[PDB]
Design a protein around this ligand. Structure first.
Ligand SMILES: Nc1ncnc2c1ncn2[C@@H]1O[C@H](CSCC[C@H](N)C(=O)O)[C@@H](O)[C@H]1O
Length: 225
């Protein structure tokens, strides 16, 4: 229950819990890469109007099976969505998704095309995760591709220019940068009891490899200039 992957999953849920609670009441939210809808229950209990987008139709089909009434699912990738939509967004959420379009675009193009509104971004910084090798979490660079193994699952990802992305964000927003290591809030996830969360935070405080994993998942709290 205290594997590196389980603790990473809980800390990710902690950040998502705090970020979604922090959105201004009644915001019109764009969630980039909504996927299978893990954040559905967090949006469901808030006064928010949410549009969840994704490039993969199969992922959105799963999200539809239990989607809240305040979430609308659109099968469009970020760049195509921002062009076509009539919506005016007042908050942008992007949890572990932006590194995909950043790998195929100039980071200033992605940043300039984001709606000019507050945002929360969680993104792996591959250069800070490289070489971490634990039984349930590993990141290796194979030629030009990143192989991120999380338990018995492997994500193959392309490189993106993290350094250019951070400078692009600073040109458009007041940026507050952090990482998952900064999280203290218990995830909304009912399966993570207060006793389990206490044990996970105690493990993080005592294990440098776990700290390195959480430190490589960068958080950005953005307010437009
Ligand atoms: N260009 C793009 N625009 C929108 N979504 C994209 C994208 N490239 C990849 N994605 C999607 O981004 C998702 C990342 S997985 C994370 C899903 C969800 N945000 C969560 O935190 O649980 C995947 O579903 C993937 O299909």
């Amino acid at each position: 229950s205290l594997t590196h992957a389980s603790v990473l999953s809980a800390y990710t849920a902690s950040y998502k819990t705090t970020a979604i609670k922090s959105i201004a009441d009644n915001a019109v939210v764009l969630d980039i890469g909504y996927g299978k809808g893990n954040d559905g229950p967090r949006y469901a209990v808030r006064p928010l109007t949410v549009t969840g987008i994704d490039t993969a139709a199969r992922m959105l089909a799963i999200a539809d099976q239990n989607k809240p009434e305040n979430v609308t699912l659109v099968k469009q990738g970020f760049f195509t969505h921002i062009t076509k939509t009539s919506n005016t967004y007042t908050h942008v959420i992007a949890f572990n998704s932006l590194h995909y379009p950043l790998a195929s675009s100039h980071p200033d193009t992605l940043v300039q095309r984001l709606p000019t509104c507050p945002a929360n971004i969680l993104i792996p910084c591959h250069h800070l995760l490289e070489g971490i090798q634990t039984p349930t979490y590993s990141v290796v660079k194979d030629e030009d591709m990143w192989c991120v193994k999380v338990t018995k699952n492997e994500f193959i990802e392309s490189s993106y220019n993290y350094d250019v992305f951070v400078k692009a964000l600073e040109s458009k927003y007041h940026v507050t940068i952090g990482s998952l290591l900064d999280c203290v809030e218990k995830p909304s996830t009912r399966s993570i009891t207060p006793t389990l969360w206490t044990a996970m935070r105690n493990f993080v405080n005592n294990d440098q490899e776990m700290q390195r994993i959480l430190s490589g998942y960068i958080t950005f709290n953005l307010t437009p200039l």
